[PDB]
Design a protein around this ligand. Structure first.
Ligand SMILES: [Fe+3]
Ligand SMILES: [Fe+3]
Lengths: 281, 283
C-alpha cells in the first residue's frame, strides 16, 4: 500500500502543494533541529510540572495531559517554530485562494500507555461550518502536527487515509485503509483540510508517553480557538511582525472580494491603533 | 408581493419562517423615539468631527464624499447600552442561528447617503467572509443583516431594494431593479435580511434635505472573525455593558453548536471573561 511521502525539509514547495492535493498529507524530515526540539521540550516540561489550576478546564473537563496555547508559555515555539519559513511557504501556497491565515490553536498533548486509538475523523469540529464547505471551495484550515517523541507502530503513530479528502463523508473506514505517520522528533506531519485520520493511542505497556503538538492555521475569516489578546504588550512586541499576525494582534486581509480587511477598528489597522512595536520593525 | 411588516410583539416562529420563505421582513416601531433620537444625537457628534488624515481602510476606497462612522458601539452609548441588546433582535437571532450556535456582532456602523448618489449594484453580504459564498443553502446560516433606518426610507431617497426569495438563486446574475421591492420605513423600524438575499442600496434622487441615514449591524456565527474588533474599548466602558453586550462584542468566550463541545475565544483553557476577571452591569 502507498505510504505517506517523506520529504526533505528543503524540498520545493510546489511538490508539497501537489502532494496535499493528491495524497492530502505529507511528512517533512528534520524541519526543526535537535536543539530547537530540545528547548521546546523542556519548556513544555515546565508547564506540565506547574500545579493544576482549580477553576474550570473547558477542554480538560480522565487523565488528560495537555498544555493549552503553548505560544504564551513556550518562547521556542513563539520565537522560532511559529515563524518557521518552510511552514509559511506551505501556508501561502495552500491558502492561495482564501487569503490571509493565522493560528487558531497550538497546544500540547501527551498520550499515556494503554490509551485506545482515536476514531477516524475530519478536523472540522471546532468550526462546524467547515463540514458543509465543498472540497472545491478555497481551503480554510490546515493541520500541522509536530511529533516531540518518536512516532512508531507501538506508541501510536498518527493514522492517515491518503486521498480521503475527496470523499463526501467519513463513514466508518477500516484501520487498514490508513497508513502510519511514523516520524522522529523534529519532523512535521502536515494534513490537508477534509483528510480522514486518527491518533494512534498508545499500545506500549510501560514507557514514556507520546508527545505531540498540534497547530491549526485557518483563514483569518475563522475565529481563532485560542485568543491571544491577554498576552502582555511587552511579550507581543518581542515577536516578529509575522508572529504578531499569526496570533491575532494585527489587521488581516482575506482575499478579494474583501477589499478592506478584517480585525480592524476605527477604520484603521489594529497594530497602528495600538502603536505596536515588533522584533523586526 | 411586498416585504411583510410585523409588529414588534409579533411571534418569533412566524418571523423565522418568513426568513426561510421571503428572506427578509420588517419590524415596525421596534425602537422608541427617544432611543432613535438620542442615538441620532450621538451620531451627529461623530459626524461633526473631521475625518482623520491617517489611513482609512474603508473610506479611502470610496470617493471623498463617503459619510461613514465605523463601529458606532464604541462612541454611541445608546447603541451599546440599548439597541445592541434589544430583546426582540436576540429572540430572532437565537432562532435564526439555532443550528449554528452562538453569534456575535461582526460590525455595526453608520452610513449616510447624500443627495445625488446613484444606485448601488445588486449584491449580497458575502464579501467580508467569502467562504460564505461556497456554503450550501442547506447549511446552518452563519450571517444575518440587521438594518436600522435612522431617517425616513422612501423610494426617492433610495429605500433598500430587496428581492424576495433571491437567496434560493444559485447565482446573483444581474437582475433589473423592478424585480426588487422597496423597504420604505420610518425611523424605529428594522429591516431583517437573511444570508444570501440579493439587495442594493437605492441611492438618493432628492436634490436637497437630510441624507438618508442608516446603521447596518451584522450578526454572525461566532465561528467567523468579527470585522470590527472591540478589544481596544476601555475596560471601564466594557464593564458598564450587560453580559449579553459583552458577548456581542467579543469580550467573552462563546460556543458554536455541537460538534464543538468546548467553545471558542478562550485562553489558558479558561473563559476569556474569567481570565480578565471581567465585571458587567448585570454580573
Ligand atoms: Fe485530528
Ligand atoms: Fe448589503
Amino acid at each position: 500500500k502507498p505510504q505517506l511521502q517523506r520529504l526533505a525539509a528543503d524540498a520545493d514547495v510546489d511538490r508539497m502543494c501537489r502532494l496535499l492535493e493528491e495524497d492530502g498529507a505529507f511528512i517533512l524530515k528534520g524541519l526543526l533541529p535537535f536543539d530547537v526540539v530540545e528547548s521546546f521540550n523542556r519548556e513544555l516540561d515546565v508547564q506540565m510540572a506547574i500545579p493544576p489550576p482549580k477553576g474550570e478546564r473547558l477542554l480538560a473537563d480522565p487523565h488528560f495531559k495537555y498544555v493549552p496555547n503553548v505560544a504564551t508559555t513556550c518562547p521556542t515555539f513563539r520565537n522560532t517554530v511559529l515563524i518557521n519559513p518552510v511552514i509559511h511557504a506551505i501556508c501561502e501556497a495552500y491558502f492561495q485562494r482564501t487569503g490571509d491565515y493565522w493560528l487558531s490553536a497550538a497546544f500540547l498533548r501527551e498520550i499515556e500507555s494503554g490509551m485506545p486509538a482515536q476514531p477516524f475523523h475530519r478536523d472540522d469540529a471546532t468550526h462546524p461550518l467547515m463540514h458543509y464547505q465543498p472540497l472545491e471551495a478555497p481551503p480554510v484550515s490546515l493541520s500541522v502536527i509536530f511529533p516531540l517523541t518518536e512516532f512508531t507502530e507501538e506508541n501510536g503513530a498518527t493514522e492517515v487515509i491518503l486521498g480521503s479528502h475527496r470523499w463526501t463523508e467519513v463513514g466508518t473506514p477500516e484501520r487498514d485503509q490508513a497508513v502510519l505517520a511514523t516520524m522522529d522528533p523534529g519532523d512535521v506531519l502536515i494534513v490537508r483540510q477534509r483528510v480522514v485520520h486518527a491518533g494512534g493511542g498508545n499500545r506500549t505497556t510501560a514507557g514514556k508517553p507520546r508527545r505531540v503538538v498540534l497547530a491549526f492555521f485557518n483563514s483569518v475569516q475563522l475565529t481563532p480557538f485560542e485568543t491571544y489578546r491577554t498576552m502582555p504588550r511587552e511579550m507581543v512586541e518581542s515577536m516578529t511582525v509575522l508572529g504578531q499576525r499569526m496570533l491575532g494582534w494585527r489587521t488581516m486581509k482575506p482575499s478579494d472580494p474583501n477589499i478592506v480587511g478584517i480585525n480592524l477598528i476605527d477604520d484603521k489597522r489594529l497594530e497602528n491603533v495600538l502603536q505596536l512595536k515588533a522584533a523586526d520593525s
